[PDB]
Amino acid sequence: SGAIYVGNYRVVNRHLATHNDWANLVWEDSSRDLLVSSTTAQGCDTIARCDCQTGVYYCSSRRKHYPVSFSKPSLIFVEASEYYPARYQSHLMLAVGHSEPGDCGGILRCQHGVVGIVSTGGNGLVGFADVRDLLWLDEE
Ligand SMILES: [Zn+2]
Protein backbone atom coordinates (compact mmCIF):
# COMPACT_ATOMS: atom_id res chain seq x y z
CA SER A 1 0.00 0.00 0.00
CA GLY A 2 0.95 3.72 -0.10
CA ALA A 3 0.01 7.09 -1.67
CA ILE A 4 1.37 10.48 -2.81
CA TYR A 5 -0.23 13.61 -1.24
CA VAL A 6 0.45 16.84 -3.24
CA GLY A 7 -1.84 19.92 -2.96
CA ASN A 8 -5.51 18.71 -2.83
CA TYR A 9 -4.68 15.38 -4.62
CA ARG A 10 -4.17 11.77 -3.44
CA VAL A 11 -2.33 9.49 -5.96
CA VAL A 12 -2.77 5.71 -5.50
CA ASN A 13 -2.45 2.48 -7.49
CA ARG A 14 -5.80 2.28 -9.38
CA HIS A 15 -6.03 -1.41 -8.20
CA LEU A 16 -5.84 -0.38 -4.46
CA ALA A 17 -8.18 2.68 -4.80
CA THR A 18 -10.92 2.69 -2.06
CA HIS A 19 -14.68 3.59 -2.30
CA ASN A 20 -13.72 7.12 -1.06
CA ASP A 21 -11.02 7.42 -3.82
CA TRP A 22 -13.67 6.53 -6.52
CA ALA A 23 -16.31 8.79 -4.80
CA ASN A 24 -13.78 11.73 -5.10
CA LEU A 25 -12.27 10.69 -8.51
CA VAL A 26 -10.22 13.44 -10.28
CA TRP A 27 -8.51 11.23 -12.92
CA GLU A 28 -7.77 7.52 -13.54
CA ASP A 29 -5.86 5.59 -16.24
CA SER A 30 -6.31 1.76 -16.26
CA SER A 31 -3.29 1.45 -18.66
CA ARG A 32 -1.11 3.31 -16.04
CA ASP A 33 -2.54 1.65 -12.81
CA LEU A 34 -3.01 5.21 -11.44
CA LEU A 35 -5.99 6.92 -9.78
CA VAL A 36 -6.05 10.45 -8.37
CA SER A 37 -8.77 11.49 -5.85
CA SER A 38 -9.43 14.91 -4.18
CA THR A 39 -8.46 15.60 -0.53
CA THR A 40 -9.81 18.24 1.93
CA ALA A 41 -6.34 18.49 3.67
CA GLN A 42 -3.40 20.17 1.72
CA GLY A 43 -0.66 17.59 0.76
CA CYS A 44 3.09 18.23 1.38
CA ASP A 45 4.81 15.86 -1.21
CA THR A 46 6.90 17.41 -4.07
CA ILE A 47 6.61 15.71 -7.53
CA ALA A 48 9.97 15.41 -9.38
CA ARG A 49 10.04 17.30 -12.72
CA CYS A 50 13.12 15.70 -14.34
CA ASP A 51 14.41 12.77 -16.42
CA CYS A 52 16.45 11.12 -13.59
CA GLN A 53 16.99 7.37 -14.11
CA THR A 54 18.31 6.76 -10.57
CA GLY A 55 16.57 7.02 -7.20
CA VAL A 56 15.52 5.15 -4.05
CA TYR A 57 12.28 3.19 -3.50
CA TYR A 58 10.65 1.86 -0.34
CA CYS A 59 10.13 -1.91 -0.34
CA SER A 60 7.53 -2.78 2.40
CA SER A 61 8.28 -6.57 1.98
CA ARG A 62 11.91 -5.90 3.22
CA ARG A 63 11.15 -2.81 5.37
CA LYS A 64 14.06 -1.27 3.34
CA HIS A 65 14.81 1.55 0.85
CA TYR A 66 16.80 0.39 -2.21
CA PRO A 67 18.79 2.56 -4.62
CA VAL A 68 17.93 1.58 -8.23
CA SER A 69 18.57 2.49 -11.86
CA PHE A 70 15.26 2.53 -13.77
CA SER A 71 14.23 2.73 -17.46
CA LYS A 72 12.41 5.78 -18.94
CA PRO A 73 8.58 5.65 -18.76
CA SER A 74 7.48 3.06 -21.41
CA LEU A 75 4.73 0.77 -22.72
CA ILE A 76 5.78 -2.57 -21.17
CA PHE A 77 3.97 -5.95 -21.30
CA VAL A 78 3.07 -6.92 -17.67
CA GLU A 79 2.01 -10.54 -16.81
CA ALA A 80 -1.39 -11.37 -15.15
CA SER A 81 -1.45 -10.38 -11.40
CA GLU A 82 -5.05 -11.23 -10.20
CA TYR A 83 -5.79 -7.43 -10.02
CA TYR A 84 -5.09 -7.23 -13.80
CA PRO A 85 -5.10 -9.66 -16.79
CA ALA A 86 -1.73 -10.13 -18.67
CA ARG A 87 -1.67 -6.74 -20.55
CA TYR A 88 0.36 -3.64 -21.61
CA GLN A 89 0.91 -0.94 -18.94
CA SER A 90 1.98 2.58 -20.10
CA HIS A 91 4.29 5.13 -18.37
CA LEU A 92 5.97 2.13 -16.56
CA MET A 93 9.66 2.19 -15.42
CA LEU A 94 11.49 -1.08 -14.57
CA ALA A 95 14.45 -1.64 -12.24
CA VAL A 96 16.24 -4.78 -10.95
CA GLY A 97 14.79 -5.16 -7.48
CA HIS A 98 12.41 -6.95 -5.11
CA SER A 99 8.65 -6.38 -5.44
CA GLU A 100 5.67 -8.36 -4.01
CA PRO A 101 1.96 -7.48 -4.45
CA GLY A 102 1.75 -5.49 -1.15
CA ASP A 103 4.83 -3.39 -2.16
CA CYS A 104 2.51 -1.42 -4.56
CA GLY A 105 2.35 2.27 -3.47
CA GLY A 106 5.96 2.22 -2.31
CA ILE A 107 7.36 5.61 -3.47
CA LEU A 108 10.33 5.96 -5.83
CA ARG A 109 12.14 9.32 -5.33
CA CYS A 110 15.22 11.16 -6.73
CA GLN A 111 16.83 14.50 -5.54
CA HIS A 112 13.91 16.43 -7.21
CA GLY A 113 11.17 14.55 -5.23
CA VAL A 114 8.57 11.82 -5.97
CA VAL A 115 9.13 10.01 -9.32
CA GLY A 116 6.43 7.31 -9.11
CA ILE A 117 4.97 4.39 -7.14
CA VAL A 118 5.54 0.61 -7.19
CA SER A 119 2.91 -0.89 -9.55
CA THR A 120 4.35 -4.22 -10.86
CA GLY A 121 6.85 -6.94 -9.86
CA GLY A 122 8.09 -10.54 -10.48
CA ASN A 123 11.21 -12.11 -12.14
CA GLY A 124 13.50 -9.95 -9.92
CA LEU A 125 12.12 -6.75 -11.62
CA VAL A 126 10.16 -3.88 -9.98
CA GLY A 127 7.87 -1.67 -12.08
CA PHE A 128 7.08 1.95 -11.09
CA ALA A 129 4.13 3.95 -12.48
CA ASP A 130 5.60 7.38 -13.42
CA VAL A 131 3.80 10.55 -12.14
CA ARG A 132 6.39 13.16 -13.36
CA ASP A 133 4.40 13.93 -16.58
CA LEU A 134 1.25 14.86 -14.47
CA LEU A 135 2.11 18.61 -14.29
CA TRP A 136 -1.49 19.40 -13.22
CA LEU A 137 -0.75 17.73 -9.79
CA ASP A 138 1.09 21.05 -8.80
CA GLU A 139 -1.89 23.51 -9.22
CA GLU A 140 -5.59 23.81 -8.05
ZN1 LIG B 1 15.02 13.76 -10.58
From Swiss-Prot:
Residues that, per the record, bind Zn(2+) 1? 50, 52, 110, 112
The catalytic site is made up of 15 (for protease 2a activity), 33 (for protease 2a activity), 104 (for protease 2a activity)
**What's its catalytic activity?**
Selective cleavage of Tyr-|-Gly bond in the picornavirus polyprotein
Q: What does this protein do?
A: Cysteine protease that cleaves viral polyprotein and specific host proteins. It is responsible for the autocatalytic cleavage between the P1 and P2 regions, which is the first cleavage occurring in the polyprotein. Also cleaves the host translation initiation factor EIF4G1, in order to shut down the capped cellular mRNA translation. Inhibits the host nucleus-cytoplasm protein and RNA trafficking by cleaving host members of the nuclear pores. Counteracts stress granule formation probably by antagonizing its assembly or promoting its dissassembly.
Q: Could you give the subunit structure recorded for this chain?
A: Homodimer.
Name this polypeptide is given: Protease 2A
Q: Which organism is it from?
A: Coxsackievirus A16 (strain G-10)
